[PDB]
């Protein structure tokens, strides 16, 4: 049987709050090492890669390696029924068509048991050439979210450009045009440029990603010429949440 117990249930709540809007269906890969997930939106414009190492769990067991197809909308709803300090436990049989979620209230007197149904899914194989670390940006996750929200009012897309003055985000609309410039001096925002890069992206998806903001204090942006953008959030020494995004033209 599979059994994964997590003390900080907030993490799982936060995870699905991030995915549900970006992705509806997804397959959960389980192993002796931990929990992983990988799926692309219907438009294949974006890809998600989740990693949750077993060592992060208070109690972990996985006899047989699994691949659980799931409705993330249906699954996020169940996690609404969880509190931010409920110990969450996931449970399933070696041959599972259902997934069991158990929330333990900290009051030590309330225990919820939700059991959801799985779906048969067509998984995708990939496919990735490893990044040229042409331009990399470490900065507060909130600030990134703010930036994406601001320019979302201006236009439908953003132009990101690197230099050693720093990195720059630009949007344009019938209203006007706006440019936010970021410079390094800490320490905190950090810009490591090896080459000047310049690409365009859709703000819609960036605004989806930023709902993963609560997971990390910082966000990382790996950018390379004519290859998809990478947006990474670390998950408290438990793993990482990685967003891939395809540019335009």
């Amino acid at each position: 049987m599979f059994e994964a117990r997590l003390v900080q249930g907030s993490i799982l709540k936060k995870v699905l709050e991030a995915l549900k809007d970006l992705i509806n269906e997804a397959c959960w890969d389980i192993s002796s090492s931990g929990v992983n997930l990988q799926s692309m939106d219907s438009s294949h414009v974006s890809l998600v890669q989740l990693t949750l190492r077993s060592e992060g769990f208070d109690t972990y067991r996985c006899d047989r390696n699994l691949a659980m197809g799931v409705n993330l909308t249906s699954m996020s709803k169940i996690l609404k029924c969880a509190g931010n300090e409920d110990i969450i436990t996931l449970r399933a049989e070696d041959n599972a068509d259902t997934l069991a979620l158990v929330f333990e209230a900290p009051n030590q007197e309330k225990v919820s048991d939700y059991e959801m149904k799985l779906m048969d899914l067509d998984v995708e194989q990939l496919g990735i050439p490893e990044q040229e670390y042409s331009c990399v940006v470490k900065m507060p996750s909130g600030e990134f979210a703010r930036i994406c929200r601001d320019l979302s009012h201006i236009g439908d897309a953003v132009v990101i450009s690197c230099a050693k003055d720093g990195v720059k985000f630009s949007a344009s609309g019938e209203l006007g045009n706006g440019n936010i410039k970021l410079s390094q001096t800490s320490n905190a925002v950090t810009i490591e440029m090896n080459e000047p890069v310049q690409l365009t992206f859709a703000l819609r998806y960036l605004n989806f990603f930023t709902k993963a903001t609560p997971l990390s204090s910082t966000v990382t942006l790996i950018m390379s010429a004519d290859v998809p953008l990478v947006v990474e959030y670390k998950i408290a020494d438990m793993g990482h949440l990685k967003y891939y995004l395809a540019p335009k033209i």
């Binding site: 692309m40 438009s43 294949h44 414009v45 974006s46 890809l47 067509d122 998984v123 995708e124 194989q125 990939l126 496919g127 990735i128 050439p129 859709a202 004519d226 290859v227 998809p228 891939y244 395809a246 540019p247 335009k248 033209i249």
Partner: peptide, 14 residues
């Protein structure tokens, strides 16, 4: 000008 898809950059099969 036109939104790209990851299949154009990554190798996708299923």
């Amino acid at each position: 000008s036109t939104q790209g898809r990851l299949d154009d950059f990554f190798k996708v099969t299923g």
